[PDB]
Amino acid sequence: SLTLADKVVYEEEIQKSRFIAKAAPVASEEEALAFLAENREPEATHNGHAYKIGLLYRFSDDGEPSGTAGRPILHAIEAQGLDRVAVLVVRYFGGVKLGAGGLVRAYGGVAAEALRRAPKVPLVERVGLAFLVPFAEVGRVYALLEARALKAEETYTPEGVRFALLLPKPEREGFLRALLDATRGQVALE
Numbered sequence: 785s786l787t788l789a790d791k792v793v794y795e796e797e798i799q800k801s802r803f804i805a806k807a808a809p810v811a812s813e814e815e816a817l818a819f820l821a822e823n824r825e826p827e828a829t830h831n832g833h834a835y836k837i838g839l840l841y842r843f844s845d846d847g848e849p850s851g852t853a854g855r856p857i858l859h860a861i862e863a864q865g866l867d868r869v870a871v872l873v874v875r876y877f878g879g880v881k882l883g884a885g886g887l888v889r890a891y892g893g894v895a896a897e898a899l900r901r902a903p904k905v906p907l908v909e910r911v912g913l914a915f916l917v918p919f920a921e922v923g924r925v926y927a928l929l930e931a932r933a934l935k936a937e938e939t940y941t942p943e944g945v946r947f948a949l950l951l952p953k954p955e956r957e958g959f960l961r962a963l964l965d966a967t968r969g970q971v972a973l974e
Contacts, residue, residue, distance in 0.1 A: 785867035787907040794898035798890045800878025801829075805898035807871040810835060816842070816870040829877040832891055834858035835870035848875075848891075852884050856892030864899050867907050871895045909953040913960065916972040918944045924966045932959065946974070 788809040795804045806823045810816040816835045824831040832853030834843035843854030857871050873891050882890055917925050922945050929936060929947075937948040951959060963971060 785907040786865055786904045787868040788866070788899075789903040789905040792898050792902035794894065794901060796894050796897070797878070798894075799880040799882055799886070801880070801882065801890070802874075802876040802878065803890055803894040804874040805871060805894045806874070807869060807895070807898050807902060809868055810837060810870045811868055813837065813840065813842075819870050820872055823872050823874075825874045828874045830875045831872060832857060832875065833870065833872040834861060834895075836861050836866070837868050848887060849884055852887040853891040856888045857895040860892050860896035860899060863896065866899060866904070869899070871898065910950050911953045911956055913949045913951065913956060914947065914974040915963065916941075916944055916946045916974060917967065918970055921967045921970050925963070925971075928962060928966045932962065934959070 788807060791806070791808040793804065793806050795802065797803070804825075808819050810819060816837065820831075820833055820835075830846045830848050830853065832844060832846050832848060834854050834857035835841065836858065841858060843858040845851070845853040853873065853875075857873055861869050861871060873895055875891075925945070925947065928934075934949060934951060939946040939948075949959075960973070
């Protein structure tokens with residue numbers, strides 16, 4: 785999954801209605817509601833929104849016909865493979881009715897455009913690994929760590945060196961395989 789690397793604002797007029805999409809990365813529901821509260825415009829016709837944080841998601845039509853604003857925004861977030869993102873779409877009615885179909889395309893479309901234009905970065909979960917290395921294998925492990933640009937907490941004991949490492953979840957498997965290979969399996973995973 786990708787998340788936003790900065791906040792973005794994108795405005796577009798559709799059949800005279802003014803749509804302003806404001807998006808930001810959010811790592812907790814507290815942050816999502818804080819962002820929405822700060823960016824909502826009280827005198828707008830509607831402040832539709834949606835956000836996704838892992839399994840947690842939320843969407844709101846704020847008065848628009850049910851299913852025409854909130855879900856389309858959430859679908860735009862999901863369609864671009866984003867997570868830990870909140871999107872608000874402020875709307876100022878301009879005198880021309882868009883119709884349910886047009887609303888779905890407007891809210892979803894403007895949210896999608898804002899998300900496409902925003903800078904994005906991979907959403908990575910940091911995880912830890914710990915293992916005990918016999919003294920005969922320590923040299924090979926330090927070389928491996930250097931070779932993979934990894935730094936670890938080290939504890940020297942009578943049975944060898946205990947290493948504690950933090951790294952991206954997607955890289956955990958590759959590292960353990962590299963470790964087991966460099967030491968020919970002579971290590972105790974903890």
